[PDB]
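User: For a benchmark we're assembling, each entry needs the component sequences followed by a predicted structure for the full assembly. Here are entry 17's components. Please fill in the structure.
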Amino acid sequence: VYNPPWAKPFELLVSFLNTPKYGTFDPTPVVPVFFPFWFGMIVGDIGYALLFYLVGRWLSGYVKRNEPLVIDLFALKLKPQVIGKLVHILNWMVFWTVVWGVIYGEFFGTFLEHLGVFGTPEHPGLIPILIHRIDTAKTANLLILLSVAFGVVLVFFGLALRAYLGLKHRHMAHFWEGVGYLGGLVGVLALAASYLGNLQAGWLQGLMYLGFGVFLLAVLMSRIWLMIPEIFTQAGHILSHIRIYAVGAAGGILAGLLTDVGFALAERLGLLGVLLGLLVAGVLHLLILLLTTLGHMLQPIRLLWVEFFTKFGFYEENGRPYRPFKSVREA
Amino acid sequence: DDFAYLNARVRVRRGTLLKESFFQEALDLSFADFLRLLSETVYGGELAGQGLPDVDRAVLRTQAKLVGDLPRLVTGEAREAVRLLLLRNDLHNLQALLRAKATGRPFEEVLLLPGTLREEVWRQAYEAQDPAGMAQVLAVPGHPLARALRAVLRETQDLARVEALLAKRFFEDVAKAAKGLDQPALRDYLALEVDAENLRTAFKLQGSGLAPDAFFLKGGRFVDRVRFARLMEGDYAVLDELSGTPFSGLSGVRDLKALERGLRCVLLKEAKKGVQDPLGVGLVLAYVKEREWEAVRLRLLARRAYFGLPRAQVEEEVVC
Amino acid sequence: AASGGLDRGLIAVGMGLAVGLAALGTGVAQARIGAAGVGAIAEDRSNFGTALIFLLLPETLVIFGLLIAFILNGRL
Amino acid sequence: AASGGLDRGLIAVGMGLAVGLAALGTGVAQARIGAAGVGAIAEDRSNFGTALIFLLLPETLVIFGLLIAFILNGRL
Amino acid sequence: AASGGLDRGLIAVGMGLAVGLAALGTGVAQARIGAAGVGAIAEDRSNFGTALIFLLLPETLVIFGLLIAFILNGRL
Amino acid sequence: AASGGLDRGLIAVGMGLAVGLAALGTGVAQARIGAAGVGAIAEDRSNFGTALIFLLLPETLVIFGLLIAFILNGRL
Amino acid sequence: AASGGLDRGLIAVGMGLAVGLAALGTGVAQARIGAAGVGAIAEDRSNFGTALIFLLLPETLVIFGLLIAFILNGRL
Amino acid sequence: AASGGLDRGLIAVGMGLAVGLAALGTGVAQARIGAAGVGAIAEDRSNFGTALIFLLLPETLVIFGLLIAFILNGRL
Amino acid sequence: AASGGLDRGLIAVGMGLAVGLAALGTGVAQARIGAAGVGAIAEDRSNFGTALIFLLLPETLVIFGLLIAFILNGRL
Amino acid sequence: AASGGLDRGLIAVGMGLAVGLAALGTGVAQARIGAAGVGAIAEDRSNFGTALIFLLLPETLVIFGLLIAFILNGRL
Amino acid sequence: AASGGLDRGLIAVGMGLAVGLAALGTGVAQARIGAAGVGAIAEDRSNFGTALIFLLLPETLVIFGLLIAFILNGRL
Amino acid sequence: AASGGLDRGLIAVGMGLAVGLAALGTGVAQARIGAAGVGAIAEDRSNFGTALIFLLLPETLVIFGLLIAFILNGRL
Amino acid sequence: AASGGLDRGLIAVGMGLAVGLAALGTGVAQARIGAAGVGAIAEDRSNFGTALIFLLLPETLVIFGLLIAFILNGRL
Amino acid sequence: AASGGLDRGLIAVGMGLAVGLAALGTGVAQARIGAAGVGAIAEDRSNFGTALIFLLLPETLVIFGLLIAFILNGRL
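Assistant: Structure for entry 17:
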């Protein structure tokens, strides 16, 4: 001139919801697919997840024992005071992350204890949690397949929108791309069943398979395509959703296995002094561990970004106008 | 070495190069307007003088810190390649020291640019009372100019011949070394430049008629002794034979001014091939050349602006 | 774990190698692309999405090895 | 397992190695090509079609390992 | 403990190879890319977050090995 | 579970190494040439056919493993 | 370890190799960042703190070897 | 007859390695020389026949493994 | 050896490898950083203080191999 | 059918190692030199005979193996 | 002379890999830094002492092996 | 003459490694030097002999393996 | 002398690695430093002695392998 | 004389490793230095004599393999 967590980034994606430039959709629905999962990325127990609470309390708050988190409500940092004031919006969105991450510490910790479902003690008396029980083939498997599912849906989210770019502009080229890749899905599912129950299908749909390959190729051949090979990589996208989700499990588990030597027991035959024997190494290692899961949460964004920045009914295509969306929804 | 560190340094540096439109813009300025325009770019942080020589100094100072540092980080293998480029600039300066030394002119008013060698190396070298003693000053880390000098120093201490042959010998050193590495691009840049330098050398001396061997440099790829000689006899027909090569425009160019202008453009195309090489030195090599071409444009256009000489008189010079 | 034959030792051993070899290949693949990219950022933000995109691609390799590990594991 | 058969164990091993080596190769193949690409893209959006075409050639290695692996299976 | 089942001894060894091979891949990956990052600090304090995130992606390789390690043994 | 004749395991192991090693060889082969390959394309759409011819000689390497695999297989 | 027999020895074998591979991976990872690193402090004295954060990270690979090693102990 | 002995397998394995390994070698050999070749056209149409001819020459090595394998086969 | 004991031979082979591999890693790490170092005295006498901090960090790798090795033998 | 004795199978193996390993070493000799040569031709047409001669010299090494292998045939 | 059981050979072998592998590590380390080193002497007499001290530092790896070998005997 | 047994099988094996290892060493030895020589050739026909004498000397390594192979032989 | 037993056969093997590995390590040490060195001589006949002594120093590694071989001999 | 005992094949294997490994070290050592060597001769014929001494120094590695092979006869 001259709920709150959900609404705040939603309000900024709205400005590009109102922009006319296609009949396709924008990445505004993105916020509920991302948000829970992002929190559920946090996984852990007594030595970890259930301690993430503290971290949060210094953000929307602070504690003045922290050399650079002095008075954060009035912002004082190793970067500017103004930035701190501006990212009050963020400090809360992180705090909410902390509130749910702690919660997924008990979500994780359901399958880490009890005599409700596992035939060993109600809470280990030294410290609760001493051995994470998921190493049973089945126990692990259900958590694996669970992760996959949120990803399969994400494959759907993109290709529908993608097909919509070519539908509503009459880009036969965009239509053909989206359609053929959904053909692609049919073949993946055939093979998978023949290993997933082993004998669940694989001849229910494994002889339908001869006809499934036919469902694929109908519109790829209509575009002709010169980069006909690229359909391998498209299969790589179905699998990628699985794979990232799989990692989300595995890396998670990896996080968990450190409490079994870092808080549970790893020194001495066994005593009631082991509690305070173990903290000498444990505490240092903790923050290194902490850092990496911050990296893990970028796996989501990348996962999304597989679809987002690569046109699946979206603007950004290896850049382009429209701006790193990660940075937008953060608030 | 690993070009990782280097590459990154160049990329930020690539951030302060201007767009075409700067150079386009500079043309309708006045000297005042120049002073302001210049003050807003990265060179501006050392612009604070008010006269033209002050601009020259600004360039000097800016380039001194932004390029003159780079081999010096460590003198790894990649760094060695870079070391050669900047070293060519020392060689000219070194030659300036030879003439200065020889008529003994109080050195202090001889002003040498910063290259890679330190200022104190020049001063001490001046205080080294002989070209042999001077070569020893150079000799300390092991320097290709040292070696070129050592090879030349045997035949005569005739200053002038020594300057010519020293340079000649220096590029001979560069040639072997450049051919000796994994930088197809450097091999090419040096090579085309050698050819171009010969071609120009031959062009410039038309009307002397001397024996070709005194002027034919080594490293060619499009210049052989016979063509070389032929042009030296004055035969321009030599120039129609490198059509279609990267030297295709050499048809009908019989003036030196135009000739160098074109040649300079060809080498510019070569610098652009090697773009963004984490592969190696292609990127740094390109950057250096670009900064010179920028520099050329700053100083000239500063002057053009300073004295208010017609726009059209100069326009060709930034036009490749 | 547990035990169940000569067979099990064989199926377990070679299985890892499938995964390991692919993983190693991915790391090298990732190293070259990974280095180049940082320079792209430096010059420009716009390519950054690309820089990310480059990185995504080698990681598929790892998983294919993992499928082989998976089937082999899936008899134990 | 659930019954022995050392013989089965050798095929189980080798199914993976075919897969691992090809993967390893794909990664090296991608790394040199990929790296060149980030600059290429930056310079030219136009060079991108090639960059994509380039990616296609490495994919072939994996397919073979798997092919041999598949043929082996349906016996295990 | 003691001397018994060859199968337990055999499997424990091969478990390491998956983990180790991936580790090797990560190391190479981190070294080039990681080095590229040091220049980044120099370039921009601002770009630094990218540099760190880039280094992170290779470590996932290691994690696949651990996952595989657990299934192989860790049930005794 | 299950067990097959003396023949299959030894031939199967060594069959894989043959394809894999050659495959790896192809990757390195592709990597140097391929990297070289892009600069010509970028400049010269016209020089491209020769660039295509350059890639072609390395392509034999996968095939050799397969040829030997056809005679071997069927003894399986 | 101690006085034992044949089963324990095999598991003992694989323990060293696991440890070695990560250790080696760390060294290569350290060598590239480290070499750059002495220069980085020099260029940017302010950046010395960055150098501190940087240096810690490769060492993590070895630590993974310990994690698998610790768990392995319990029969070793 | 699909089945046979361990003996046939012993000779078969080490024969294969010969085929895989040489092929791998051919690729590296091809890769440096191959790298030179694309440039060779650009500079010189005249060098193209030679460069192209050069590429063939390490390849004889590959043929030797196949020849030795063919003559050995048909006794097996 | 000396007297019987099945365990002892098995652990002994691998005892060398754990240490040997870490040592090899120490070397790669040192070669690059050390190389950076010789120049460092030249630029700055001062850089020696950085140099003291730098060198130690790779050395940690050897210490770990020996530590685990102590556990293998040094108990008997 | 057409099985052989214990003696023959092993010896055939060790014959191959000579042929493959050398094929790789020779390839390495040819790659650097071969590459150097194409540049020589471009510069110097006279030198072409030398360049041609240069490539010949490593290929002989494998051939020494083939001669010993030939002699093995007629017993093998 | 003397001979032993199956066990004895494994300790006899294994002593060497420890020393040798570490030795390999010392060499790679020394070679690069040393290579860098020589110019410093040339320029300045004063820098020589650090360089000299530097060379010892990787070599320490070998000393450990020799110790491991000394203790090993008496069981050999 | 005629067949023998188990002993022969091992000897063929180690023979290959001996020759092959030497061949690999030769390849590297010739490759760097062989390339370096050609530029000397370009300048001078006079120096060509030196280059020629140079190339041969590494080839001796293969010959040395073969000498050792003869001693192994005489039962081969 | 003559033939022997299985234990002795092991005792020869690792002994070869002790000498060979140390030699190999010495070779890398010689290669990098050896390449650097010559210029000092070239300039100065006088400087040769330091260079000579420097190159001499890594070679001690090799004697250690022989020392291990000597102590062992009369036990094979 | 023919054949031999069970033992002999094992010693035969390891004789090769001793020799081969040193040879391999020699090849790399000689290659880098050899490459450095050639330019001096061209410039100065006189300097060939220093260069000549230089190449010689790595050759001792080859000799060590022959010496260990000589002493071994006494078991073969």
